[PDB]
Design a protein around this ligand. Structure first.
Ligand SMILES: Nc1nc2c(ncn2[C@@H]2O[C@H](COP(=O)(O)OP(=O)(O)O)[C@@H](O)[C@H]2O)c(=O)[nH]1
Length: 361
């Protein structure tokens, strides 16, 4: 198989979609397939030579040509499009392409905002997608309600062994204990304000806590907000993946205090693969990763003092924690790429046939 994939986002920054596409590509090549990845210009990062640039959004004419040419020249058995929002690189590809098209819908909000987008003026184009992948069962059911055709739920994957076998960061684990936060801490939806509001109760119990923070942001503003407790914040910046795996595996707990906006809790999966216990907001996506409290602690959404207690309960009860970790490590095999790339491949096989190729409309 020759598989064309389109990522709508630059690889210049980390994200769930970017990282899904690149690992999926790598995994597919290791099975003997040829994969070509189209994405916007990512000049700031070293990419393998199978990643092709769609240009920079200001998308202009050179990009429309590049997409038509990449399809026409690519000899693809399947075109796999990710997040075809309008406007986007993916949606451009979906409008230019004819034939064996697969789409993954990484995000959703509501039933209504799925029926309308699918059944609206972009319907003609959404109907061209022959294999439709949703990242949850409810999302999948919405797509089925919308267009009257079969969609499939397939979770995003991880490489479970790259966390499980990550080397510890130096000086770890710590005796005062660490809690990990990962993400762009200054979008409110990521819930840094909740972890911040829980720091005083945490610090009054573990007076040598560290909050290990992965992600880009304004350390100055957060330091200023932690007030007298800013000494407890250790910022790794936007670290690389191997150091991120090391960071997760050297923390005693991972804190996901998100306020909303999450369709798949992929960082939670990364913590479960690492063998690090999880404490999470309890958005619907986190509830399904953690299995209703079986593989991690779920805290109500905007609950500062419930979040303190949870993290304190996890850190002072070693058997409770070791339980989570052991249960989570059994379950996380669900998400491992060898499960997930198999499901995706059965979609590729459904959609494609003896010498049928993707062509330009
Ligand atoms: N290496 C690295 N990975 C990150 C960083 N931030 C997020 N990620 C990864 O990117 C993915 C996206 O999760 P998340 O960024 O929090 O969702 P999003 O930013 O809102 O798309 C997960 O695989 C994270 O481990 C970072 O600063 N460094």
């Amino acid at each position: 198989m020759r598989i064309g994939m389109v990522c709508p986002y630059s690889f210049d920054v980390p994200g769930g979609v970017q990282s899904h596409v690149l690992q999926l590509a790598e995994v597919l090549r290791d099975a003997g397939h040829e994969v070509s990845v189209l994405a916007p210009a990512s000049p700031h990062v070293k990419l393998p030579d199978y990643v092709v640039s769609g240009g920079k959004a200001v998308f202009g004419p050179a990009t429309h040509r590049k997409v038509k040419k990449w399809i026409a020249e690519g000899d693809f058995d399947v075109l796999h499009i990710h997040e075809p929002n309008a406007p986007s690189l993916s949606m451009l590809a979906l409008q230019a392409a004819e034939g064996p098209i697969v789409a993954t819908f990484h995000t959703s909000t509501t039933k209504s905002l799925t029926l309308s987008v699918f059944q609206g003026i972009l319907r003609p184009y959404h109907e061209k997608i022959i294999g439709r992948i949703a990242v949850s069962d409810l999302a999948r059911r919405w797509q089925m309600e919308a267009l009257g055709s079969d969609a499939v739920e397939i979770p995003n994957g991880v490489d479970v062994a790259s966390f499980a076998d990550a080397p510890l960061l130096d000086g770890y684990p710590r005796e005062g204990r660490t809690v990990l936060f990962l993400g762009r801490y200054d979008e409110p939806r990521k819930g840094m304000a909740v972890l911040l509001a829980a720091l005083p109760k945490l610090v009054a119990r573990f007076p040598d806590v560290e909050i290990l923070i992965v992600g880009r942001g304004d350390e100055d503003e957060l330091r200023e907000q932690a007030g007298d407790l800013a000494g407890h914040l250790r910022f790794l910046g936007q670290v690389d993946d191997a150091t991120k795996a090391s960071a997760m595996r050297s923390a005693d707990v991972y804190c996901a205090p998100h306020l909303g906006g999450e369709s798949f809790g992929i960082v939670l999966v990364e913590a479960m693969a690492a063998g690090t216990a999880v404490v999470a907001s309890d958005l619907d996506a986190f509830r399904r990763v953690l299995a209703d409290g079986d593989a991690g602690r779920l805290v109500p959404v905007d609950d500062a003092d419930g979040m303190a207690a949870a993290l304190i309960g996890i850190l002072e009860d070693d058997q409770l924690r070791a339980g989570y970790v052991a249960r989570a490590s059994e379950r996380v095999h669900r998400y491992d790429w060898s499960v997930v790339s198999a499901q995706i491949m059965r979609v590729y096989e459904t959609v494609s046939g003896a010498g049928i190729k993707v062509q330009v409309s």
